[PDB]
Structure formats: structure tokens, C-alpha cells
Amino acid sequence: GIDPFTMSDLPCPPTNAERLHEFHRAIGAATPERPTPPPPELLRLRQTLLDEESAEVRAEIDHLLARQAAGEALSAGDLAPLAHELADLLYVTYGALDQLGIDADAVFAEVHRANLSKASGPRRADGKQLKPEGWRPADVRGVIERLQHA
């Protein structure tokens, strides 16, 4: 029940995943709330966008590396194109999850849990990260199942 005294501006920004949902509504493509098997044309589209942005990211990394090989000292400002493309890559990665009706935050949270837990393990003498006692793998199947009934 909201009222004349209510604050409408939320005190926390939408997530990047929430931004994609808003973007898809804007382009007239309002996407599902729950995991939804896609037609093949949607899967081809998503793969095309990933390949495009991944190719742009690789070109910016290559360009920075070529300049370092030539003896150049990079500046913070030199990173803008790489930063821009890494963000474009997040955009189309989130974009794919959103078009699948899969909440990207819920899946990321489960991956993160497993990765963070693995980070609490010891290192092998050569530096390789080992798993700690009690380690449990990411259960993304369980996450997709929950999302279908939440």
C-alpha cells in the first residue's frame, strides 16, 4: 500500500541483468520471466552477437599488446576501447540469458558461490588453486528448476 508520503525512487540501482530486461522491452521484444526454450533462430542470433563482441574485445587486447611490444607505456585512457568492448560483451551475454527467460543474477550467484568457495582452498606448490574441504560444485540445473517455480 503506497501513499502521499511514499518515496518512489528506490535506494538501489537496477542490476545489469535488470537493465537488459528493460532494453528488451524497449526494442519491442518483451522477454519471459521464467526459463523458456528458444527457437533456433534466437540461438543463432545470440551466437552471432557473442562472436562479434568477442572478436572486438580480442582486437583491442591485441592492439594494446602490440603497443607494449613496441616499448610503449600504456595510460589509463588507453584502456577505454577495451573497456567499451568488454562492456559490449557483458551486454550481449546478459542479453542471451534474458532472452532465455533465465534470471542472470541467480545463475551468477551460484557460480560465484562455487568459485569463491574454491578460492578458500590451499595452493599447490606451483600455484595451482586447490579445492577446500567440503567443496560443492555449481548446481545450475537446481537454479533453473527453482526459477521455473519461484
Long-range contacts formed by 51-55: CB under 8 A, 24+ apart: 52/92, 53/85, 53/88, 53/89, 53/91, 53/92, 54/89
List the one residue from 31, 49, 91, 131 that touches a copy of itself (CB under 8 A).
91
Among 40-48, 65-73, 81-89, 121-129, which window interacts with Mn ion (CB under 5 A)? Answer: 81-89
CB 75 to a copy of itself: min, Å: 6
21 scored as a contact of a copy of itself (CB under 8 A): no
State how far the Cα of 119 lies from the Cα of 129, in Å rounded to an integer: 7
**Which residues from 27-46 bind a copy of itself, rule CB under 8 A?**
27, 34-40, 43-44, 46
The residue type of 111 is V
**By rule CB under 5 A, what count of residues binds Mn ion?**
4
**By rule CB under 8 A, what count of residues binds a copy of itself?**
76
56 scored as a contact of Mn ion (CB under 5 A): yes
Q: Is 85 annotated as a binding residue?
A: yes
CB 143 to Mn ion: min, Å: 11
Residues 6+ apart with CB under 8 A from 98: 17, 20, 21, 24, 31, 104
56 contact, one of a copy of itself, Mn ion, none, CB 5-8 Å limit per kind: Mn ion
Question: Is 127 exposed, middle or buried, given 0-12, 13-18 or 19+ CB atoms closer than 10 A?
Answer: exposed
The site for Mn ion (CB under 5 A) is made up of 56, 85, 88, 103
